[PDB]
RNA sequence: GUCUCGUAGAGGGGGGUAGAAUUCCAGGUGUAGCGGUGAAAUGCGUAGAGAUCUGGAGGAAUACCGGUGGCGAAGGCGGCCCCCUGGACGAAGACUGACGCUCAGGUGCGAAAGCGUGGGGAGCAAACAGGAUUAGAUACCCUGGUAGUCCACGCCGUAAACGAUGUCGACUUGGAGGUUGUGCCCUUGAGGCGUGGCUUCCGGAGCUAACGCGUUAAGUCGACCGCCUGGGGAGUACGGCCGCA
RNA sequence: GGUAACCGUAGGGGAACCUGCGGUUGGAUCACCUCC
């Protein structure tokens, strides 16, 4: 994203911005690259190198969130309503 | 012998005739890296200098031209 | 006629065959020599000697139009072929400059083999 | 918002309102609070080589920070206009202003 | 190049394309091919390197 | 793994734009040949060629820089600029606290050639037509020239796709160079001490049948996956799956 | 600062193979008394 996009964000689900390393906070920042790029694709059909590194920020997000199922429903549970995951 | 690395710039200018008509041939070959002894990064610098000054007429392709 | 007197030339250097042409500076073609003009074929037109003696035979159609001072431009990689101008020295033109035209392709057309 | 670094080129018998193209060029910049670190003149000058049966024709070198959206309406300016023969485009690293050697 | 020189006549001078020009320009270019198997033509030029 | 500041780079798309050159078209000059081979011939030629000049249309790749340089998981990527964007590394400092490695099935990418529908067509060029020549042989040689090579949206998923060396770790003397970061010193102008990545070449111990590899291992170990069991028949027959073929 | 061969694929054809496009270096062959 931007400076200004991650130094908003980071506050949002962390802490009193010096954490920026929780597990909460890494999902809110890939999940804002997808939601973001998503509209990169819909017209650039051709482009296959940038997919990689989509397909990676998404396999870092599912085992993120995969190591949060084990370690805590709970705040599992509220981080995928309030961020709109489907699981 | 080289002058970037003596004189330490940081970043070469392309708008500038004076340095980079030093390191053209007579025909407007840009002159290879081993022949002047600049660093490779800077002689990298030089061909987009060459390029980009070459696109604007600043300087010519080759002496064919009249 | 028409006086020139510091007229242009042109030769052309293939592997195969050499022409000669004087121009009257802005593209004007008033005489011309080929190395097959005269009968020659074969291996007898390879050697510059076919161009020396096309050179010289250009000769008798220029000097109707006076010409005293010379200007030539050489194209082609023929070997021997930059011995052709000091005929024209010698033939009394008044060379001051020769230049050199190849035409180098800038990577563009494929170029087609020769024979293996 | 970014640097950017802007030259272009003038037909000669056109030059008498390039006053009037700065003129023009500036305020559509300042338009959106876009800021010009300098302007050059350098007069009338000779090519390299010819372009469109031209030997010399007129320069104009500007350096902006200035936003995208106007970065394309001037783009978009000179494309349509005629009256310029050749453009160029940059980014640059950081807000350069120190004199240039062209002038040197 | 343009050949302009002072008033000796024929000081030859056509000899230095030896600096200014590669000499395998027009016969590896404009007809034929080239560049292929290029590593083997490349190791040679400092294989002989020797003291 | 994440964050702050930076660096390098033909990483991938989308759109413009510039010069060099092969063609074709239009108009001047000018004459008898041009082209191609060892000769040649076919072929172009005066209701006007090549050669030269001016102008114009269209296509492809970007000379020079350009290197046993760079990027990428691999295939592969090279004019310049704008927009979008993947990855790597350096400096300190902070944060999460085992979130890791591998991976049967599966999914995706995958040079060129080849198909399906529609465009474009300069050069090159399988098949094919003509001429010629050796050698019973055509083929090689030379004129023309169709698919194709270029662009759109899909199939095909094959190569000596090789570094003939699967991925991930820790541990074991040296030497020379390249490329790119960065600390200490008054920098006594391009210079000295030190520390990181990625790379090319000698060579010790060790290993291998040998050639050789040798901190980027084919050395001493561990975790997982794939594969092999004499040569030909044969990566072939019959089936299943995939594919319009 | 000599030469080739093997791959993938498409068109043509048998002592035997050609070209079009891309790729690799594994760029070279032999060790035959009775007589034909």
Same mark, same amino acid.
């Given at each position: 994203?931007?400076?200004?996009?991650?130094?908003?964000? #980071?506050?949002?689900?962390?802490? /009193?911005?010096?954490? +920026?390393?929780?597990?909460?906070?890494?999902?809110?920042?890939?999940?804002?690259?997808?939601? &973001?790029?998503?509209?990169?694709?819909?017209?650039?059909?051709?482009? !296959? !190198?940038?997919?990689?590194?989509?397909?990676?920020?998404?396999?870092?997000?599912?085992?993120?969130?995969?190591?949060?199922?084990?370690?805590?429903?709970?705040?599992?549970?509220?981080?995928?309503?309030?961020?709109?995951?489907?699981? | 012998?080289?002058?970037?690395? =003596?004189?330490?710039?940081?970043?070469?200018?392309?708008?500038?005739?004076?340095?980079?008509?030093?390191?053209?041939?007579?025909?407007?070959?840009?002159?290879?890296?081993?022949?002047?002894?600049?660093?490779?990064?800077?002689?990298?610098?030089?061909?987009?200098?060459?390029?980009?000054?070459?696109?604007?007429?600043?300087? *010519?392709?080759? /002496?064919?031209?009249? | 006629?028409?006086? $020139?007197?510091?007229?242009?030339? &042109?030769? &052309?250097?293939?592997? @195969?065959?050499?022409?000669?042409?004087?121009? /009257?500076?802005?593209?004007?073609?008033?005489?011309?020599?080929?190395?097959?003009?005269?009968?020659?074929?074969?291996?007898?037109?390879?050697?510059?000697?076919?161009?020396?003696? =096309?050179?010289?035979?250009?000769?008798?159609? #220029?000097?109707?139009?006076?010409?005293?001072?010379?200007?030539?431009?050489?194209?082609?990689?023929?070997?021997?072929? %930059?011995?052709?101008?000091?005929?024209?020295?010698?033939?009394?033109?008044?060379?001051?400059?020769?230049?050199?035209?190849? *035409?180098?392709?800038? @990577?563009?057309?494929?170029?087609?083999?020769?024979?293996? | 918002?970014? &640097?950017?670094?802007?030259?272009?080129?003038?037909?000669?018998?056109?030059?008498?309102?390039? *006053?009037?193209?700065?003129?023009?060029?500036?305020?559509?910049? +300042?338009?959106?609070?876009?800021?010009?670190?300098?302007?050059?003149?350098?007069?009338?000058?000779?090519?390299?080589?010819?372009?469109?049966?031209?030997?010399?024709?007129?320069?104009?070198?500007?350096?902006?920070?200035?936003?995208?959206?106007?970065?394309? %309406?001037?783009?978009?300016?000179?494309?349509?206009?005629?009256?310029?023969?050749?453009?160029? $485009?940059?980014?640059?690293?950081?807000?350069?202003? %120190?004199?240039? *050697?062209?002038?040197? | 190049?343009?050949?302009?020189? @002072?008033?000796?006549?024929?000081?030859?001078?056509?000899?230095?394309?030896?600096?200014?020009?590669?000499?395998?320009?027009?016969?590896?270019?404009?007809?034929?091919?080239?560049?292929?198997?290029?590593?083997?033509?490349?190791?040679?030029?400092?294989?002989?390197?020797?003291?």
């Amino acid at each position: 994203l931007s400076t200004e996009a991650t130094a908003k964000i #980071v506050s949002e689900f962390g802490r /009193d911005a010096n954490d +920026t390393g929780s597990t909460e906070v890494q999902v809110a920042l890939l999940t804002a690259q997808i939601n &973001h790029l998503q509209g990169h694709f819909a017209e650039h059909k051709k482009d !296959h !190198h940038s997919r990689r590194g989509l397909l990676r920020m998404v396999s870092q997000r599912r085992k993120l969130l995969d190591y949060l199922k084990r370690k805590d429903v709970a705040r599992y549970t509220q981080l995928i309503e309030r961020l709109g995951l489907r699981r | 012998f080289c002058r970037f690395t =003596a004189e330490g710039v940081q970043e070469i200018d392309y708008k500038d005739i004076a340095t980079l008509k030093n390191y053209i041939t007579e025909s407007g070959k840009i002159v290879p890296s081993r022949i002047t002894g600049t660093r490779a990064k800077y002689q990298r610098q030089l061909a987009r200098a060459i390029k980009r000054a070459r696109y604007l007429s600043l300087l *010519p392709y080759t /002496d064919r031209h009249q | 006629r028409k006086q $020139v007197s510091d007229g242009v030339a &042109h030769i &052309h250097a293939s592997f @195969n065959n050499t022409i000669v042409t004087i121009t /009257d500076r802005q593209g004007n073609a008033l005489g011309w020599a080929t190395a097959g003009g005269s009968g020659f074929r074969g291996s007898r037109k390879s050697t510059p000697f076919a161009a020396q003696v =096309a050179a010289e035979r250009c000769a008798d159609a #220029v000097k109707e139009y006076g010409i005293k001072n010379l200007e030539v431009m050489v194209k082609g990689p023929g070997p021997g072929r %930059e011995s052709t101008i000091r005929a024209l020295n010698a033939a009394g033109f008044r060379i001051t400059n020769i230049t050199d035209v190849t *035409p180098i392709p800038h @990577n563009g057309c494929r170029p087609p083999k020769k024979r293996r | 918002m970014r &640097h950017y670094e802007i030259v272009f080129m003038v037909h000669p018998d056109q030059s008498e309102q390039v *006053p009037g193209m700065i003129e023009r060029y500036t305020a559509a910049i +300042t338009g959106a609070e876009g800021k010009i670190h300098r302007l050059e003149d350098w007069g009338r000058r000779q090519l390299a080589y010819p372009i469109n049966k031209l030997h010399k024709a007129h320069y104009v070198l500007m350096n902006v920070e200035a936003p995208q959206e106007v970065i394309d %309406e001037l783009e978009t300016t000179f494309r349509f206009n005629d009256a310029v023969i050749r453009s160029m $485009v940059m980014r640059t690293k950081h807000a350069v202003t %120190e004199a240039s *050697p062209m002038v040197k | 190049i343009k050949v302009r020189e @002072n008033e000796p006549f024929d000081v030859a001078l056509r000899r230095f394309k030896r600096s200014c020009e590669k000499a395998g320009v027009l016969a590896e270019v404009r007809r034929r091919e080239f560049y292929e198997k290029p590593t083997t033509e490349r190791k040679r030029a400092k294989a002989s390197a020797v003291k």
